[PDB]
């Protein structure tokens with residue numbers, strides 16, 4: 001079996017993408033944030049504290065005939081940006097672009113943090129990192145991909161995210177019409193439970209490729225590109241008006257500038273992010289100052305190949321016994 005779903009940015013700055021998911025019987029469609037950086041599928045529902053509910057679409061376990069409460073299981077998670085959620089768990093049928101998994105754990109939120117209540121276009125998260133990061137207790141619940149693996153035509157899923165446009169998530173197949181060149185595969189360490197890999201170096205604009213190991217994670221749930229502070233500094237050094245702002249939280253630049261591209265190595269291959277994808281957007285509507293999409297990972301503690309990187313390539317999360325990650329130019 002296979003599945004294909006279109007995914008869309010929740011705003012005009014590509015802060016996140018949501019993909020529709022059908023949960024329960026008859027199907028309840030929710031729009032979730034497909035996150036390769038977590039392993040929890042949870043959604044807002046009939047159980048979340050009302051005043052914690054904005055205009056999100058909720059899951060009502062009670063209206064689904066295949067739902068089953070998972071006796072005694074609870075969950076609690078906190079994310080990298082401080083948000084958090086917790087609740088209980090049900091198992092139900094979950095479909096993604098025609099790809100159905102029965103008995104998938106759907107974690108029902110009882111409480112959500114303020115950033116989630118305020119983001120009206122995200123109904124929950126669908127985690128895609130290793131099941132070892134799952135927060136359900138006492139027994140960890142497998143991700144949608146671990147559960148679909150038996151059925152998949154090939155154990156893989158690809159991310160094809162768009163720059164200010166829709167994209168696609170596909171499961172169990174590789175669409176050769178979607179990228180150019182061939183796919184370069186790189187080893188993944190699962191020690192931390194993440195889609196963790198090592199980049200071979202970088203290049204700023206039309207300058208030299210520097211061979212330096214960049215250990216990082218590929219995470220569709222992270223907006224920007226977090227690199228070591230000395231690589232970020234070499235990028236911004238090429239942009240005349242750019243500077244580091246303590247008030248805004250990072251490098252800012254005149255919106256007016258044409259920024260250089262940024263290339264990161266994948267083995268022998270190079271993936272070129274267009275200077276424009278690095279222009280995240282102005283600080284505030286009308287400002288002459290814009291937010292840089294390449295930020296320092298000094299304060300996070302790990303490098304993150306988030307959305308600004310991920311959208312410049314065709315990405316293959318190959319979930320075979322020995323997982324690997326493939327990158328293609330598109």
Ligand SMILES: CC[C@H](C)CNC(=O)C[C@H](O)[C@H](CC(C)C)NC(=O)[C@H](CCCCNC(=S)NC)NC(=O)[C@H](Cc1ccccc1)NS(=O)(=O)N(C)C
Pocket residue numbers: 015016033035036037038039077078079080081082083119125133135219220221222223224299300304
């Ligand atoms: C078991 C716990 C596991 C390890 C949790 N994994 C994780 O926590 C990684 C996972 O991908 C989350 C998903 C996110 C939707 C809440 N990413 C994040 O938490 C990041 C943080 C990236 C690193 C930032 N950390 C720091 S200290 N920066 C100074 N958020 C993001 O990148 C959000 C994503 C987002 C956007 C819009 C709506 C919802 C969520 N964009 S952002 O807020 O940082 N951007 C607006 C500035």
